[PDB]
Design a protein around this ligand. Structure first.
Ligand SMILES: O=C(O)c1cc(-c2ccc(CN3CCc4cc(-c5ccc(C(=O)O)o5)ccc4C3=S)cc2)n(-c2ccc(Cl)c(Cl)c2)n1
Length: 123
């Protein structure tokens, strides 16, 4: 409905990156999903997510959630609530957000557009 950006947890990306408290259950939009190079393990999916203010490309799906992607319930434009995530930090300092449990609140086809004008989150 009207005020589409009000459907998303504006500021959650910065909170996940700046404070790292995992108690929040933010509502985010999927902007894009792609496989990463895995070679010889289960496929792994990387997501570009939006909270309405920012996008962030550092999200990875837990492999237990792969069927959501592979059966097309989880695709570009859908709106999701994250019920469980963790943050991991690489040796080089970059952070990865692993999505463990999530719920699709609105399918891609029911939303249909990138909500708002989110900009990339910087480090
Ligand atoms: O081929 C490419 O294009 C590519 C390739 C990577 C790329 C490679 C390697 C890594 C390292 N790594 C790997 C898998 C992984 C899995 C889990 C985890 C916990 C629970 C579950 C589960 O149930 O599945 O999984 C927790 C931590 C990791 C980490 S730190 C990250 C990222 N990336 C990449 C680089 C930077 C970022 Cl910020 C991201 Cl999200 C991906 N891109």
């Amino acid at each position: 409905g009207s005020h589409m950006v009000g459907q998303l947890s504006r500021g959650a990306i910065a909170a996940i990156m700046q404070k790292g408290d995992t108690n929040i259950k933010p509502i985010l939009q999927v902007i894009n999903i792609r496989p990463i190079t895995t070679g010889n393990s289960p496929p792994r999916y990387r997501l570009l997510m939006s909270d309405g203010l920012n996008t962030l490309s550092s999200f990875m799906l837990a492999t237990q959630l792969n069927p959501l992607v592979e059966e097309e319930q989880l695709s570009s434009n859908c709106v999701c609530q994250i019920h469980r995530f963790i943050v991991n930090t690489l040796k080089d300092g970059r952070r990865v957000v692993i999505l463990m449990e999530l719920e699709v609140l609105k399918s891609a086809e029911a939303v249909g557009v990138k909500i708002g004008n989110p900009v990339p989150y910087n480090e």
